[PDB]
Nucleic acid binder design. Sequence first.
DNA 1: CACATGAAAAAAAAAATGAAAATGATTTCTGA
DNA 2: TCAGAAATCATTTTATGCATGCATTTTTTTTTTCATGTG
Lengths: 797, 797
Amino acid sequence: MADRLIVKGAREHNLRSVDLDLPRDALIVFTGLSGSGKSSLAFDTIFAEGQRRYVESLSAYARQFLGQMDKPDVDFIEGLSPAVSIDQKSTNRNPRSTVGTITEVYDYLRLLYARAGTPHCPDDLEPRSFSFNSPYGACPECSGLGIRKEVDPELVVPDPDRTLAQGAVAPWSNGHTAEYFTRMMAGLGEALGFDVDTPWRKLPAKARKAILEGADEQVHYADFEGVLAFLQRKMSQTESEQMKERYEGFMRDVPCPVCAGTRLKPEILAVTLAGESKGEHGAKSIAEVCELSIADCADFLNALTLGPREQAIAGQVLKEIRSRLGFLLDVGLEYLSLSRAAATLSGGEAQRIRLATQIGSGLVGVLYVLDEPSIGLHQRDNRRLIETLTRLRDLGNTLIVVEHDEDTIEHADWIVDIGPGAGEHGGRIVHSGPYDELLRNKDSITGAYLSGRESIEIPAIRRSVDPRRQLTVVGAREHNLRGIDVSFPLGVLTSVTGVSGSGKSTLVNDILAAVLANRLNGARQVPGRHTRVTGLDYLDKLVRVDQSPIGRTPRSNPATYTGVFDKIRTLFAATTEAKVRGYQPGRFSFNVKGGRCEACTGDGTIKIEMNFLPDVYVPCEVCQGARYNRETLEVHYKGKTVSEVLDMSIEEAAEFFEPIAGVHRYLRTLVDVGLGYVRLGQPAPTLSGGEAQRVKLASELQKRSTGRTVYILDEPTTGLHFDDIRKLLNVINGLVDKGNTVIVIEHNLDVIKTSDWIIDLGPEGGAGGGTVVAQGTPEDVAAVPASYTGKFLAEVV
Amino acid sequence: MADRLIVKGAREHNLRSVDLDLPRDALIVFTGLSGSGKSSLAFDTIFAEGQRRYVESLSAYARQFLGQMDKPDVDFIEGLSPAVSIDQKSTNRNPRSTVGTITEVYDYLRLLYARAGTPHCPDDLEPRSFSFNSPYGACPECSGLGIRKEVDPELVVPDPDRTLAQGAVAPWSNGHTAEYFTRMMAGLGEALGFDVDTPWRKLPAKARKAILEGADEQVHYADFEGVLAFLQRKMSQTESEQMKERYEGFMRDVPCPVCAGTRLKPEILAVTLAGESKGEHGAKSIAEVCELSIADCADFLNALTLGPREQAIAGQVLKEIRSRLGFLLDVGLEYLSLSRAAATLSGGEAQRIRLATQIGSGLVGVLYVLDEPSIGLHQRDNRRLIETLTRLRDLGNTLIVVEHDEDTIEHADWIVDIGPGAGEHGGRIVHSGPYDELLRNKDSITGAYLSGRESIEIPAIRRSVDPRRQLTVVGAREHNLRGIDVSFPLGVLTSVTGVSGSGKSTLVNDILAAVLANRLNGARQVPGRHTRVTGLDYLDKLVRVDQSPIGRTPRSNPATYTGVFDKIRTLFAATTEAKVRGYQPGRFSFNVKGGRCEACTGDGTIKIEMNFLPDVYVPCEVCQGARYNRETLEVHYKGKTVSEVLDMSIEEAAEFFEPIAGVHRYLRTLVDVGLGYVRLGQPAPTLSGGEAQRVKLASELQKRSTGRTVYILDEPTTGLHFDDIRKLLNVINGLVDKGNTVIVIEHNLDVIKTSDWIIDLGPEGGAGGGTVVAQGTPEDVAAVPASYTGKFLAEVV
DNA sequence: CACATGAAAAAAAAAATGAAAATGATTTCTGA
DNA sequence: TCAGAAATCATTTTATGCATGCATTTTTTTTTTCATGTG
Ligand SMILES: Nc1ncnc2c1ncn2[C@@H]1O[C@H](COP(=O)(O)OP(=O)(O)O)[C@@H](O)[C@H]1O
Ligand SMILES: Nc1ncnc2c1ncn2[C@@H]1O[C@H](COP(=O)(O)OP(=O)(O)O)[C@@H](O)[C@H]1O
Ligand SMILES: [Zn+2]
Ligand SMILES: [Zn+2]
Ligand SMILES: [Zn+2]
Ligand SMILES: [Zn+2]
C-alpha cells in the first residue's frame, strides 16, 4: 500500500520546481512568509490536483465544472486523495441555507421529529414534512424563506420635486431602457388617468399609491403592472450582478407575516411536534430548537425524555446529533444558533463550520487542506481546536494546515517551511521535518521566531491616554451587548479583544463604524441599536481598511492606486526624449489611447474563444504583454522603458527613484509594510486580501493625516507570518504617532500585548457575554483574573 | 483508524431497512437477480451518498452542484469514502474528448514531446503547445476539432422534383415560418435570377450553389449568407437539443482540409517534432503515435533513443506513460487507438477506459463502485481483468462490483447476495460472506447456480442448418475486416463471438444491420463497406432490440406499449355499470378528457416551483395519484378499479385476467420473459435498459411472425443473472421455433453453448482480427484449437 | 361456408414548441 | 515656490424592449378492413 504523498516538479507561482515527500495520514503544517508560495503549494497546486483528479472522474454533468476546472503545473504527483479545501472564501449567500442545513444537523433533527413528534393538539408524519425547503413543509406564503421583500419608499424616490417625465427614479433613468421606461410611464399616464409630468410631491397620494400598485391591460405593445411587479420580473430576468446589487439595495426584508418568520408551515410547528420535553424545561418545537444556541440545543437534546418505545427508534439519531453538536462545541461555536442564516457568518465562522461538518460527515481517506483555522478564534479555545484536528486525522484523513500559530506546531507530525525570502526569492523549500531541526535551522525565519532567537518585544513605554479626549459610545444594545458605554482613547492604539461571540464585531463594525461613517463621511448606514456616540467633534473622517480589492479591473494596479504611477508618468514626460518628441504625461498611462496599442487596448492579454472551451488569455503579438505601443516603449528614463519600470518589483523600485523623494517615500512605506516583492504592474484583481489591506494602509500612512482621522481594522493578522506582523505593527505605530486613533479587533497575543489600550469584552461568547470585563493598558489588564485575554497576557509580559 | 463500511436503514426502491457491514480496502461483489435491488444498493444509495457527501463540501458551486444530486433514504452510513462510479452512462460526447485525453496519457505524451521534440531539419516549446484544446496547438481552420460540418444538397431536399415555393427543402416546411422562408427565397429569386415556383431539378445549378453559399445582395433589405450558413447559425443559436438533432441529423462531417484529421497546427505537428526513434526503423510524430494502437504505441515507446541528456529528464515521463499503457493493455483494450473519439466508443469500451484511467491516476482512499465491467470483454481476457482490478484494491482503495461472472467471484474478498426475488417480495439480504457460505446457502439462487446445483443445460439436439437458405454477406471489408464473406443460417439461433475488437459489431450492427434495415424496413442508414448481401429475399422485415426506452413520456406504459391496455379498457367499458352509464372505452384512458382528473391532466402528479430550488412533483390532492375522476374510478370490474389494475404487477395481473386469453397470452409472455415484478402502471422513462429489452422481446414474441422475420440483438446478457439468462434463452428458443432467425453478439459462453450456430471472429482483436477462424455447431468450433472461444467451450461441451 | 374474434394497417386527435456605475486621468487652488 | 486634496470629465461597459405566433412532431386513440382459423 501507499503511505507517503510524493510531489515532484511543482513549478507553479514563485515555487522553483519544488518537490516534496509527506507522511500520509498525518498532521502536516505549512509555514512561511506571506507570499512565499505556501498557499500556492498547499491550495493552488496540491488541493487543485486532488480535487481535479476526482471531479474529472465523475461521470455526471458530461463535463468537469469550472470550465475544465484548472490544471496545476506539477510534473509527477502521487499518493493523493480526493482533496477538500476549507477556507474563508467558501462563504455563500443562498437564502435557503442555514447553519442547521450546512452542518446537516437539521436533517437528523427532521428525522428525529418524524420518528418522535407528537401533535399534542388535544402517523402521517415524514421527515420531508419538516423541511422548509420542501413543499410539504414550507410556509405557504413565504415559500419557505422567512423573509418578504418590501420596497424602500424613500430610497427609490429621493427627489419628489422633479417632473415625472424626467424619471429620476433609478429604473426609469438607467441604460438605454430609460427612454423605454419613459414610454411606458407616459402610456400609464393615460391608462390610469394621471399626468406624465407631475412630480411625486405634487402628485396626489392616491396617484402615488396607484403608481406603486400599477395598472393592467395592454396599453402601448407593452405592459406595466406595478413597481413591485417590474422590479420582481427584473430580478427574475437578471443578466448583470451590478443590477442585482443596485435593485437589492433598496429591497427591504420583513419577517413573513403568516409564518412569523420561522419559514415553516404554521401547522407543522409545535402543533405537530410538541413531543419534545425537558431542556431548560417544558416542551419545544423545531423552530424553537433551531432558534436555540448550539450549547443550549445540545443540553436540551441530552435531557429530553421522549419515552422508552419512542427512544428505541430515536436513540441512534440522538447519538448522531449529539456527536455533531459535540463537534460544533469543540470547534468553538457555542454561541451560534441553528436557525442563523448562512449570509450572516464571518469567514472564520464559515471555516469552523465547514471543518465541523467535515469531521461530522465521517469521510475517510480524504485529503484536507485548510487555511488558517484560528482566525476569529480566541487563544483560550485554540487548544481545543487542535484536539479536533487530530481527531479528524484519527479518522484516516491527511491534514494540511497553513497556520502560523505556535500551538498548532509542536503538535503537527510534519512541518514544511517555505520561503527563504518573500517573493521571487522565496519560492524554495527551506525545511521539511518533525519540528526539531526547525529550531536548529539557520536560514529559517519561522525557526528563528519559534526558538526565541528573534521575537517581537513589548515596548517599554505605552502612549499616555488622555481622558479629556475620548470617543464614548453609550446605550449599545445591538444583538448581545447588555446596554453598555465604552470609551475609546483618542490618539493612541487601542485593541478590543474577547472570546468569539462576545460582541466585538457588533460593538465596533455595525455600531461605532456605521455611526462614524454616516456622521463624519456622510454615509447612510443603519447605526444599529445605540443611544449616543459622543466625542465626534475631535475627528474629521473615519477610514476602515479591509480585504476588499483595491480595484476590480485590470486597469488598476498598486502603481495607480497609490497615486505614484502619475508621478512616474510625469517623470517620463519630463525626460528630455519625451520632451523633444512632445509626449504628454497622460500618454504614458495604459488607460488613454496615446500610449496603448490598438489590439490590447492597454490590457496586455487578449481573449480567445473556442467552440466548447472557456475563454483563454494570450498576450498581444505587438506588445507581447507590454500593454504599450512601440513608440511609447522606446522612451528611456534613466535608461529604462516604461514597461520595465512598471513590471519591476517594489524593492528594486525603491532602489530606483532614489533622487526623487516624492515617489521614494511611498515606495519606502510600501517596503516597510512588507510589500517589497509585489511588482508595480500586478493587476489589482490578482492581489490577495491581505496584500490589499496592506497596500491600503501603506498608501494611507503618507497623506498628511494630521492627527484628525480614525482607522478601523478587522483582524489584520489573517494570513500573516510573524515578520509580517512585526512590519504591520511598525506601520500602525507610525500611523498612531501622527496623532490619529487606530482601533483593531484581533486575537493575536503579540499585537494586543504591544497595544496602548485594551478593551476585553464578555466573560463568554453569546448570551454569556456582551459586557466589558477589563479595560486599560496591557499590563493592568493582565492582572484581571476574570479575563481570559488577561490570563494569556500574564505569561507574555 | 477505520477499516469497515457500515450501512443501516437503506430503503431505496424495494430495499427494506437493509443493514450491511463490509470490509474496507477489499474486493466486494454484489449479486442478485436483475432488478432485485443490487443497482439500488450499489449506485443509488452507496455511491450516491458518498459522492453527495464529498461534493457538498466543494466550494466550486453555489451549493447547486449537479442539480443537488439526490438524498438516498439511509438512516446512517459510516466509514464512507469519496465514491466514484464506473457505469455505462459515462458516454462522453464532447467533440474535444479523445481516448488520449480521457486517460491523461495525452498529457504526459505532450510533456515528453516537449522535453524531447527535436526540430529535425528545419527551447521555445511548452506542454500546452501540443494540445488541440488550447489555441497554442489547435489549428485556425477547424479549431482543433479535426472535422468541419457540411451537408450534401440531396439528402436535405426530399423532393427535388417538387417546387421550392412551398418548402422543397426539408427545414423549409417546418412551422408557420414556411411563409417567411418563401418570402426570402422569392426575394433571392428576384435579384439572383431564379424562379420561386421552379423545382430543385429544374432550377439552374448556379441558383443551387448560390442559395447554399449566399449572395452579396439585399433580399427582404437584408443580405443572404447562404443555406448552410443560415442553418449553422440556427443550430448555434438554439439550445434545445431534442428539437435540433432533427436538423443536424442530415449534416455530413468532412476532415479539416489542412489538419487532415490530426487536430493540430502543421508547424507543431510534424515539421519540427519528428525526432523519435523506432524498434523497426525511423521516427514518428505525435499524430502518428496517437494514431497507433495501444500495443503498438507502447512497444514503440519501449524503443526510444534520444541521447543521455534527454533520457536523464524523460526517464520518469517514459515510466509513467509505460505504466499507463500497461494498465490500458491489461484491462483489454489492445486494439484501441490513442486518437479514437470518445463518441464512437461503445459502453463497455468507455467503462474499461475509465477503469484504466482510475488505476493510472493513483488516487488513494477512493471508494470505486463498478457496474458489470466484463461486458464487451472476451472470457480469455477476463482473468487479466481481475489482476488489474485487484491492483486498485492494492492502491489503498475499496472496490464494490455488481457482478455475475463466475471467475470474478471466487476472487472477491467479500460477497453479498441480495434480492432472492426481483419484486417487492424479493428485495432483502440473503447472504454476506466470503464465497464459502454462498455455495452452502440453500435459498440463494446465485449460490445454487455457482455450486452447480442447477445450470443452463446444453440442448440435446441443435436445429439443423439449411444450406439452401442462408444470409451471406460478401465483401465485408470495413475496418479490420478483410472482405470476408459470412454465412448466417436462417431459422436457427446464431451467435457471433470473438476477442474484443475482432470486428463483430462492425460486421453485424454496421454492415448487416444497416443493409437489412434499408432493404426491409425502408430506412436510409449507411450500409457500411461491403460488396454484396445475398439470401435477403427469404425475409420480410428486420427487428432490432436495444436498451432504448419505450417512449420518453409518462403517458407511456408497459400496458399501453404492449397494447394490452386497449383490451383492458374495452373490457372495463363492457361492464354493466359502464354500459348503463354510457361510458366509451376511451373514458378509461388517462390521455383524454373523459375520465382523467383535469387538474392532473391524467399524469397523477403536479409540479410545484419555488425560487432557488429545483422542480418538485407532488401527487394531485384530489386524484390521490389515481389519475382519474371519482366517477370513472367508481367502476368495479371484478372488484377492482382502473387505477387499482394499473397498480397490479405483471405477474399478479397474469394471475388476474386468466379467462381472457387475448390478454392472458400477453401477460404470460411477459412473466415468462421475467418481468413479473414490473407493475403495469410503471412510467416508461423509469424502466432501465433491461426492462425495455425484455418487454420488447415479450411483445415481439406475440407478433404473428409467420417465420419470415429476423431479429438482431446486441449483448442481451448485460446485467443479467444466470436465471434471467435462462428465461431469456427460453424466450429466444420460443421465438426461433416460430421460424424466425435470431442473431446475438454475445461473449457469455452460456448462450454460446446453447446456441445452434456459432461464428468466431478474429484470432486477436484489432489489426490481427477481421478473419473467420471457426463456424458451425458449438462442438465444431470447440474442436478447432486456434479458437479462444473453442478453448473455453471444450470444458462445457 | 357464414362468422366471430383476433389482429394488420391506416387516419384522427391532441400536447409541446418555436445608456448609468464606476476607478483613472486632468486641472485647480491651496496650503506649508 | 512647489507638492497635494478635491472636483470634474472622459472612457468603457450598460442590459434595447415586444408579441406574437400557425405549422410540424410524436405519441396515443379510434376505426376499418382482413386474413385465419373455426365449428
Ligand atoms: N447577523 C446576525 N444575526 C443574528 N445574530 C447575530 C448576528 N450578528 C451577531 N449575532 C449575535 O450577536 C452576538 C455577538 O456576536 P459577534 O459580535 O458577531 O461576535 P464577534 O464579536 O466575535 O464577531 C452573537 O452571540 C451572535 O449570536
Ligand atoms: N469509429 C472508428 N474509428 C476507427 N476505428 C474503428 C472505429 N470503429 C471500429 N474501428 C476498428 O474496427 C474494430 C471494430 O471492432 P468491434 O466490432 O468493436 O469489436 P467488438 O464488437 O468485439 O468490440 C476495432 O478493433 C477498431 O480498431
Ligand atoms: Zn412564511
Ligand atoms: Zn497589444
Ligand atoms: Zn484543422
Ligand atoms: Zn389529479
